[PDB]
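2024-03-11 09:14:02 INFO receiving multi-entity request
2024-03-11 09:14:02 INFO entity count = four
2024-03-11 09:14:03 INFO echoing inputs for audit
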Amino acid sequence: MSQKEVYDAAGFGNPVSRGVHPAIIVVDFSYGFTDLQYPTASDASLQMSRTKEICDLARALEFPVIFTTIAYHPGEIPMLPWLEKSSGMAALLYGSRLVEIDMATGIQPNDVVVVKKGASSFFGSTLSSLLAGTNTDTVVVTGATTSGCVRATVVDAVQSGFKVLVPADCCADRAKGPHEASLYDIQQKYGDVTDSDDILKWLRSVAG
Amino acid sequence: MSQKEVYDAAGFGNPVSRGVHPAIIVVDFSYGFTDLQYPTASDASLQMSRTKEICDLARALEFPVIFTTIAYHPGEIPMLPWLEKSSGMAALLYGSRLVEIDMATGIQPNDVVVVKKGASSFFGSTLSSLLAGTNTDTVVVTGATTSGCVRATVVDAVQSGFKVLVPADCCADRAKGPHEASLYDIQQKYGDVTDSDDILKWLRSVAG
Amino acid sequence: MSQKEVYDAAGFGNPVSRGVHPAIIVVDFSYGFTDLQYPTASDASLQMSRTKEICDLARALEFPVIFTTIAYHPGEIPMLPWLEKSSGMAALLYGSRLVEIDMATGIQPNDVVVVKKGASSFFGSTLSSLLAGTNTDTVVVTGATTSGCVRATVVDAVQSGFKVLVPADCCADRAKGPHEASLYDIQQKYGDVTDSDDILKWLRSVAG
Amino acid sequence: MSQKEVYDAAGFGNPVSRGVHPAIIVVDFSYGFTDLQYPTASDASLQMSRTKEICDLARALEFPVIFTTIAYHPGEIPMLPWLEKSSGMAALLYGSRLVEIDMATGIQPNDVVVVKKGASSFFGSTLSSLLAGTNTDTVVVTGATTSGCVRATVVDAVQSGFKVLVPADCCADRAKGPHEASLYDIQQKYGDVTDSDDILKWLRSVAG
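2024-03-11 09:21:47 INFO inference complete, emitting structure
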């Protein structure tokens, strides 16, 4: 059997039947991840403009739009073993520009920001409670990086009881390889990989 | 700059300074994932044998050895959106042979089994509590599959405050591509990828 | 100011605006907690019959009905510090009668049982995912004991994003004092304390 | 039999065998809970002074000292059902004086502050990860209020795998009844209730 045949027989890759209460999660489009002056950053310019379109529509339709950022207090750095492996993350300190949401996302004062300490937007955060509290059934995940925080957020979203959509053109990464690998795993096991055009049309449809 | 230089500059790929309270986590070496009569399974013959060596030594040294398995009640199936995407997992039912831990692992009567409903062994489970309760500082993660439950468990282990070691020869997957992509991401961001020979020598060293 | 005036000015004791997607959580009505032959048990006979009425109605109306039980593998006992304080709980072993749901609840084969290791039905369990996955917005909490597992479950339910109702006549405890104290705290801070008559009428109303 | 005999027979009230890696958790000694100009506050003058002694010693011994606070973005308010019941908490806004830690605690610039959205300091927060990451085995819990955030934090600490000590003279509440009821439940089921004198002597003993 080919890999495609193996995954098919294993029952992977089924489509998600989308719900009627969407929410947008924008994962770590902070300057630390989007401004190339910083060692941890990637080129996310196109991805942020696509994400802005999605968020602008969702916000106007009164669907939840939630941004995430990784930020640390100095005393937390030696306490968290993730920062031993991923030591570049220690630069993401409260009060620094690195932790601020990139303005290219079109973030507005109303928009809730959730601060987290790991990869997943759900881990050690209030995110699940906000989604459950707004009766969310379907999440659209965007952000940086595809192979890191985005993939981790996607796994947690489906595990938490939410259907997951991922517009590939809204996900940025440091390299094509890990980007493609995570989108494959997501499409097979965790959510539907699609594009912003689909998302936009879909959001208009559920509002209608 | 090259991918290697980008990840280096971003602060990834640092070694783990190993602790002195090890625990072994054996992720989903149930018959459902190891016996090729089931379409969800992979060839894990070598991997289980190497995992057995690690577990036997750890158990003899009184380090926690914890096995995980995915099992569902019929009523849970329509409740969990993961099962929409990965519908093959719905075969993993309480009372079935699919959910039983494969005896090739060497599992003993008093070894703890954690039942979970998703990919990560930590998600919606008692795992973090067992490890914190035993003052564990370093986990060795093994099992099936590398790109699925293993990877998810590794991300959660480091996020939960445990240093992570992953012996690659103890991890099985249904395809080479996803296996290697996950090992890459782990080595960069989440833990140290190594082999069973290293783990065995290391466990004896902490015992000494 | 009187205590009543203090709590009122502090903004406590507001009513809950009930949602339209109810679920019933039956906390630890296992024989270990309901059969007086066991040291950990209380008289829960009246409470179980009221709970049975609620569950029978909810089940027939196709609202989720979920039972919880505390059960341990022998190897878990030394790992969990809760069992150092509450050592009677160590008797609740898998395969024992103590962990079985009391038949007086009217539990049916279809009903999902969630196994947990602590007080809260949400802690280290799949409960939140089942409720989110069924688009639940309002939970009715019943079980044993009011001051222990019930109160803990109630706190976690509201924290998790669900509105909470507690029929007092469905909650059993070892003594009146702790029972009354927890119902007070719940009414002030966490949910609406009411009775089974109210719940039954309310469930019929949302179905209608 | 009497209540005392019932709790004894049920296996409650056992002493905690204290560990050797202490951490201090200071629960919500923010101005919102300690400054009587705010209707959510209680007199915590003595309690903060005794907590300061514990924190000063722990900090000098390089044991983690972690402060918690409840803070909301305006957008989060309609999302969290806890705020429907306990509407006074909606005053606890980012940027306000209400959410700042009271300087009477002795809090130092590099002491870690964890922001949370509910009662328990562990719920939807990074707290468990910080404690596991520092190999903490025993927590001392202090703060406001005994029957609310303190109690919830204590339940979660033991559930999360940490032994719990609660110096009663470091816990403040807005009424005597709930304070005593919570201390009773804790002493029976979750941790050891003691005083600051004991904690100070104990901390020096583990240091020796």
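2024-03-11 09:21:48 INFO post-check: The beta strands of chain C are 22-27, 65-70, 112-116, 138-144, 163-167, 171-172, 192-194.
2024-03-11 09:21:48 INFO post-check: The interface with chain B takes residues 64, 73-76, 79-81, 110-113, 115-118, 124-130, 133-134 of chain C (CB under 8 Å).
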